Design an enzyme around this catalytic site. Structure first.
Site, mmCIF file in Angstrom:
data_model
loop_
_atom_site.group_PDB
_atom_site.id
_atom_site.type_symbol
_atom_site.label_atom_id
_atom_site.label_comp_id
_atom_site.label_asym_id
_atom_site.label_seq_id
_atom_site.Cartn_x
_atom_site.Cartn_y
_atom_site.Cartn_z
ATOM 1 N N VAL A 1 0.807 -1.214 0.000
ATOM 2 C CA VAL A 1 0.000 0.000 0.000
ATOM 3 C C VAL A 1 0.846 1.272 0.000
ATOM 4 O O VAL A 1 0.319 2.377 -0.126
ATOM 5 C CB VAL A 1 -0.965 0.028 1.203
ATOM 6 C CG1 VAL A 1 -1.981 -1.100 1.093
ATOM 7 C CG2 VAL A 1 -0.188 -0.067 2.510
ATOM 8 N N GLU B 1 12.181 -5.072 0.860
ATOM 9 C CA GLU B 1 12.886 -4.456 -0.252
ATOM 10 C C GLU B 1 11.883 -4.393 -1.397
ATOM 11 O O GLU B 1 10.995 -5.241 -1.496
ATOM 12 C CB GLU B 1 14.128 -5.256 -0.655
ATOM 13 C CG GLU B 1 13.838 -6.563 -1.365
ATOM 14 C CD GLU B 1 15.092 -7.270 -1.853
ATOM 15 O OE1 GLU B 1 15.363 -8.388 -1.376
ATOM 16 O OE2 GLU B 1 15.798 -6.721 -2.729
ATOM 17 N N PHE B 2 12.007 -3.376 -2.240
ATOM 18 C CA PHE B 2 11.072 -3.178 -3.340
ATOM 19 C C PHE B 2 11.595 -3.817 -4.620
ATOM 20 O O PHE B 2 12.746 -3.604 -4.999
ATOM 21 C CB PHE B 2 10.834 -1.678 -3.564
ATOM 22 C CG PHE B 2 9.993 -1.367 -4.773
ATOM 23 C CD1 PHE B 2 8.610 -1.395 -4.698
ATOM 24 C CD2 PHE B 2 10.587 -1.044 -5.984
ATOM 25 C CE1 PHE B 2 7.834 -1.113 -5.808
ATOM 26 C CE2 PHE B 2 9.817 -0.764 -7.101
ATOM 27 C CZ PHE B 2 8.439 -0.795 -7.011
ATOM 28 N N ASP C 1 6.304 -8.823 -11.068
ATOM 29 C CA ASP C 1 6.413 -10.272 -10.947
ATOM 30 C C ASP C 1 6.558 -10.948 -12.305
ATOM 31 O O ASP C 1 6.322 -10.335 -13.350
ATOM 32 C CB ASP C 1 5.239 -10.863 -10.151
ATOM 33 C CG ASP C 1 3.895 -10.619 -10.811
ATOM 34 O OD1 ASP C 1 3.615 -11.251 -11.850
ATOM 35 O OD2 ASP C 1 3.109 -9.808 -10.277
ATOM 36 N N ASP D 1 4.402 -22.594 -2.617
ATOM 37 C CA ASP D 1 3.562 -21.843 -3.553
ATOM 38 C C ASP D 1 4.390 -21.130 -4.622
ATOM 39 O O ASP D 1 4.210 -19.945 -4.875
ATOM 40 C CB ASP D 1 2.641 -20.863 -2.820
ATOM 41 C CG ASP D 1 1.424 -20.466 -3.653
ATOM 42 O OD1 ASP D 1 1.049 -21.213 -4.579
ATOM 43 O OD2 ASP D 1 0.841 -19.411 -3.369
ATOM 44 N N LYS E 1 5.031 -20.039 -8.034
ATOM 45 C CA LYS E 1 4.292 -19.772 -9.262
ATOM 46 C C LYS E 1 4.765 -18.399 -9.704
ATOM 47 O O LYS E 1 5.262 -17.637 -8.879
ATOM 48 C CB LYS E 1 2.785 -19.785 -9.001
ATOM 49 C CG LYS E 1 2.304 -18.774 -7.978
ATOM 50 C CD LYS E 1 0.801 -18.884 -7.798
ATOM 51 C CE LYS E 1 0.293 -17.940 -6.731
ATOM 52 N NZ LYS E 1 -1.177 -18.127 -6.543
ATOM 53 N N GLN F 1 3.528 -15.553 -10.286
ATOM 54 C CA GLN F 1 3.048 -14.401 -9.529
ATOM 55 C C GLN F 1 3.847 -14.159 -8.251
ATOM 56 O O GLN F 1 3.845 -13.045 -7.719
ATOM 57 C CB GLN F 1 1.576 -14.572 -9.149
ATOM 58 C CG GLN F 1 0.639 -14.732 -10.324
ATOM 59 C CD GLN F 1 0.365 -16.186 -10.682
ATOM 60 O OE1 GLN F 1 1.283 -16.965 -10.959
ATOM 61 N NE2 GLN F 1 -0.912 -16.558 -10.677
ATOM 62 N N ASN F 2 4.512 -15.198 -7.754
ATOM 63 C CA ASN F 2 5.271 -15.103 -6.504
ATOM 64 C C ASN F 2 6.781 -14.964 -6.694
ATOM 65 O O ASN F 2 7.548 -15.120 -5.744
ATOM 66 C CB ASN F 2 4.975 -16.295 -5.588
ATOM 67 C CG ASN F 2 3.596 -16.221 -4.967
ATOM 68 O OD1 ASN F 2 2.951 -15.171 -4.987
ATOM 69 N ND2 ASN F 2 3.141 -17.333 -4.400
ATOM 70 N N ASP G 1 6.485 -14.079 -1.164
ATOM 71 C CA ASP G 1 5.222 -14.613 -0.650
ATOM 72 C C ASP G 1 5.401 -15.956 0.042
ATOM 73 O O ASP G 1 5.068 -17.012 -0.517
ATOM 74 C CB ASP G 1 4.180 -14.729 -1.767
ATOM 75 C CG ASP G 1 2.756 -14.815 -1.235
ATOM 76 O OD1 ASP G 1 2.572 -15.226 -0.068
ATOM 77 O OD2 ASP G 1 1.819 -14.469 -1.989
#
Lengths: 278, 50, 260
Positions: free
Chosen positions: A2, A61-62, A66, A107, A109, A111-112, A125
């Site tokens: 956020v 850390e940024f 993905d 997990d 994948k 996206q992670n 994640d």
């Protein structure tokens, strides 16, 4: 996520994650306690944790985006082999570190997996991760996002361990080469059948004990195994060799992340920047 | 009813106990961000939102 | 269930972490109100709680680790000791269990001594004091690795070793003096010797660097604890290990002497 912020003195960028508060979620308990122990260049770094009465803040850390978004952005453009090779090599380093520190990710994948403009890729994640023991106990069943879920999980194995993450990484390897999921099942049984149609229906010879597994059914159709040259056509001999070892049915024969680091596929590995702007 | 169901060291003063627990800035200085309120603060970290 | 490719890495890592996650040996002397006897009462109750909710032995070991580390930093009056123990069991359950019991169940099992909100606040406080460092090595984690060195596997030896490792949780004096890997070593040898007459195998000397000589102080203590177990004020572990599930090992006669 956020909030994000760049540091003036250093130029380093951070990301702020928030959790609203059965008390602290078990997923948060595990994610935080495990990430604190997992400092590695290919694992997203947890920088700080801030507790308030009803909110839990995590500073990471940024990283720019993905791998799923990157592949979608490159849906009609080939991801150059040197970049695929670099990403896989880095993912294996991050995963080997996890396994050597008794953590299963569970997990993996696209996206992670987070990437930056410098060519780094990092595991993220850890909400579904768990610390394992030696030897393992029975853990949570039906774990791992379906498309990336190993056949031992699908067949209801009493025990699973590090091999389940290598399976997912093998699926991701294939997906980088094609930008399409290797085994895109619609349900657990469809997932199993997609795997069988590609790798052949496993028998006692290929995978000792398979016919005794809790969710094995003698009614399974018996599909023949096809050549890996047909599974991922653009992949070269060394690449097919590695992929075949990551997708071995028998978890005890499936290649480990640290053994995979020495595979001939990585003989000419470099660290190129992404071929598309992030 | 089960044998495990038992008090070990007597009754407690709930008001006092709640008080002592309700009791429980250094991070706010580190990150120039107000966590309790969910608000950024002017500082060396430039908090662009999402 | 074996992970042969990472066994050694993991053992080495646990040996690193057990030093970092160790509670302060003399902490009870700094507590104004509570004592080792009260701690023993608390841990014995947690054994019962674990039995009632069918929790893993690992969960119990983790909870005790969290409690000892918490009390190493924070003073606690006796009326709040059970709240600390309850929050620790809740946290250990969330970390370790497939199905952690709900907070309402933990409240219930204290015979409603504390409220849900108090337990959750204590959970928060424990997490802060432990700085979220929950992935602690336990005696149990070392024992399961040592068991792989059996020639061959003996389930009675395993159950008796687990029993002895659990007994060590009850008595802070003397067991806070010893690392989990050492207590596990003493427990494995003592169990192996009791059941089979065999001793700490050479393969474990190679793996751990421990010998019967280095294990001796802990072994001497654990043998005494074993010998005196039927007379101990706390009996929940003995009762637990009478179960056929654990091959009734708490009913076995300890050897009168060791052969070191």
């Amino acid at each position: 996520v956020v909030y994000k912020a760049r540091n003036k003195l250093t130029g380093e960028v951070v990301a702020l994650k928030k959790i609203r508060l059965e008390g602290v979620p078990s997923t948060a308990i595990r994610e935080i306690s495990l990430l604190k122990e997992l400092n590695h260049p290919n694992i997203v770094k947890l920088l700080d944790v801030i507790h308030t009465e009803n909110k839990l803040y995590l500073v990471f850390e940024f990283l720019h985006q993905d791998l799923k978004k990157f592949m979608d952005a490159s849906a009609l453009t080939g991801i150059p082999l040197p970049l695929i090779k670099s990403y896989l090599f880095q993912l294996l380093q991050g995963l080997a570190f996890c396994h050597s520190h008794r953590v299963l990710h569970r997990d993996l994948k696209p996206q992670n997996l987070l990437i930056n403009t410098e060519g780094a890729i990092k595991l993220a994640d850890f909400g579904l991760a768990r610390a394992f023991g030696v030897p393992v106990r029975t853990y949570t069943h039906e774990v791992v996002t379906l498309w990336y879920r190993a056949p031992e999980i699908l067949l209801g194995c009493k025990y699973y361990s590090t091999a389940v993450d290598i399976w997912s990484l093998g699926c991701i390897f294939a997906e980088m080469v094609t930008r399409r999921a290797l085994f895109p099942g619609d349900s657990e049984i469809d997932q199993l059948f997609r795997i069988f149609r590609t790798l052949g229906t496993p028998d006692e010879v290929v995978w000792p004990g398979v016919t005794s597994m809790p969710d094995y059914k003698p009614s399974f159709p018996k599909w023949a195994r096809q050549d890996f040259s047909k599974v991922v056509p653009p992949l070269d001999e060394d690449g097919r060799s590695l992929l075949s070892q990551m997708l071995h049915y028998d978890p005890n024969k499936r290649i480990s992340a640290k053994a995979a680091l020495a595979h001939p596929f990585f003989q000419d590995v470099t660290k190129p920047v992404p071929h598309l702007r992030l | 009813k089960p044998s495990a169901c038992r008090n070990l060291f007597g009754p407690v003063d709930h008001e006092e106990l709640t008080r002592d627990l309700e009791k429980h800035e250094a991070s706010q200085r580190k990150w120039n961000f107000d966590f309790q309120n969910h608000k950024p603060l002017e500082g060396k970290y430039e908090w662009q939102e999402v | 269930n074996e992970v042969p490719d990472y066994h050694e890495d993991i053992h080495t890592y646990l040996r690193e972490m057990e030093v970092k996650c160790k509670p302060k040996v003399g902490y009870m002397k700094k507590q104004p109100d509570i004592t080792n006897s009260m701690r023993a009462i608390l841990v014995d109750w947690l054994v019962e709680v674990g039995e009632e909710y069918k929790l893993q032995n690992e969960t119990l070991h983790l909870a005790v680790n969290y409690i000892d580390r918490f009390l190493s930093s924070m003073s606690v009056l006796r009326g709040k000791l059970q709240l600390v123990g309850t929050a620790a069991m809740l946290l250990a359950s969330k970390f370790e269990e497939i199905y952690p019991p709900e907070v309402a169940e933990f409240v219930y099992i204290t015979d409603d001594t504390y409220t849900k909100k108090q337990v959750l606040r204590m959970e928060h406080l424990v997490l802060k004091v432990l700085t979220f460092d929950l992935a602690a090595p336990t005696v149990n984690q070392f024992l399961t690795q040592y068991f792989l060195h059996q020639q061959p596997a003996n389930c009675k030896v395993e159950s008796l070793a687990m029993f002895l490792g659990e007994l060590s949780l009850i008595d802070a004096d003397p067991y806070l003096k010893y690392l989990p890997s050492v207590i596990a070593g003493a427990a494995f040898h003592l169990a192996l010797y009791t059941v089979t007459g065999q001793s700490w195998p050479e393969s474990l000397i190679r793996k751990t660097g421990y010998t019967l000589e280095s294990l001796k102080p802990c072994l001497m203590d654990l043998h005494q604890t074993y010998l005196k177990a039927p007379q101990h004020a706390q009996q929940s572990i003995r009762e637990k290990y009478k179960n056929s599930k654990y091959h009734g090992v708490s009913l076995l006669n300890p050897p009168e002497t060791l052969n070191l």
